[PDB]
Amino acid sequence: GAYKYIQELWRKKQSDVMRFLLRVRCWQYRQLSALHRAPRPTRPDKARRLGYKAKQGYVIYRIRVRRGGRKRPVPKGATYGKPVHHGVNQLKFARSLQSVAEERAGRHCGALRVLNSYWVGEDSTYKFFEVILIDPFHKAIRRNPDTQWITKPVHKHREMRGLTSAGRKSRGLGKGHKFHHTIGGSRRAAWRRRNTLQLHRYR
């Protein structure tokens, strides 16, 4: 089936074909606003593996994000404090750019419920992304049982809480020895557990 071809082609990103296209796409995207609703998914394939479905009430915003790290917002330098914390230039945000991308798509379209995102290119200055969104109150989603989990109000603002695939990754949770921080729910919760004087009745 064509999707497997498309998939394998897109892995040849250093190839002559895909490099040509990526350059032309990235030029084109750069010549638009920072947030615009793509009429259809640039990457159909990827979108399907991430859970897009080509029916009504699935949406896709292409969102630009400025690239590079995070300089410490303090006037001049003047991070007054112990010279551990004197750093301002070479320091780096916890979440990814892709998460930031989703978060912004989420912010803008409050009714819409961020499902998942994928990449469409990168300049020196910008990255580009494509956030799949969903109306939780369009009948075609509501009545389809397999999606109607997103219409539940626990799934409000997934991206804001660190719950999309992208913003999950910063949280630092997976099974096995390479984690332990996040061995309750999350990073914060384990610390909480580990720094509770459990003070029993009888002692």
Binding site: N195, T196, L197, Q198, L199, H200, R201
Partner: protein
């Protein structure tokens, strides 16, 4: 400042710990709540064991625990396959099934098949309607018990086989255990190099020809 003899001891009360002290005045109230909730769940699953489903027998890991045996999480697929219970059905008759369990040795497998067989013997499957089709048991074994089973269903008891008094043949007596262990240690230690020197010597014998 320390004064004449004592453990140079490190307490961990430098963070704001009194902000996160966790009292246990719940616990009685808790213990009850669980207990009510427990009795409710029994009553809901009416003649079904309060326990839960039946669970496999399983040995612990590590040299330490090794000798003991617990209840496992669920019966493997091979164990269901050999017993002849369709895995999707086994859930519906109160048989725990995990499918992530390997099955290394045949001693642990046949035991766990035996478990399921025994379960299926002493199980009282009620028919779907009061009108009785196949599988569903007789109204005798139904009226005489729509009874719950208190406690864990067919409990595992880690058990020992009594060895009778032998006579000590002149061979047991001959054995030099401590030595044997020392030897067995050193051969694991030295296996690998010995093989490298032999590989060296073999190369020297072949090199002599050419």
């Amino acid at each position: 400042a320390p004064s004449r003899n004592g453990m140079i001891l490190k307490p961990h009360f430098h963070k704001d710990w009194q902000r996160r002290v966790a009292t246990w005045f719940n616990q009685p109230a808790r213990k009850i709540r669980r207990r009510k909730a427990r009795q409710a769940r029994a009553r809901r699953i009416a003649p079904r064991p309060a326990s839960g489903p039946l669970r496999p027998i399983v040995r612990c890991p590590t040299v330490r625990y090794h000798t003991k045996v617990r209840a496992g999480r669920g019966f493997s697929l091979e164990e269901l396959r050999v017993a002849g219970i369709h895995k999707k059905v086994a859930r519906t008759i109160g048989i725990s099934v995990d499918p992530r369990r390997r099955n290394k040795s045949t001693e642990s497998l046949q035991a766990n098949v035996q478990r399921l067989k025994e379960y299926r013997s002493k199980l009282v499957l009620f028919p779907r309607k009061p009108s009785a089709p196949k599988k569903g048991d007789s109204s005798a074994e139904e009226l005489k018990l729509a009874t719950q089973l208190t406690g864990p269903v067919m409990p595992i008891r880690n058990v020992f086989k009594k060895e009778k008094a032998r006579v000590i043949t002149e061979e047991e007596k001959n054995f030099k255990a401590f030595a044997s262990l020392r030897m067995a240690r050193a051969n694991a230690r030295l296996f690998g190099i010995r093989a490298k020197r032999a590989k060296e010597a073999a190369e020297q014998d072949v090199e002599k020809k050419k």
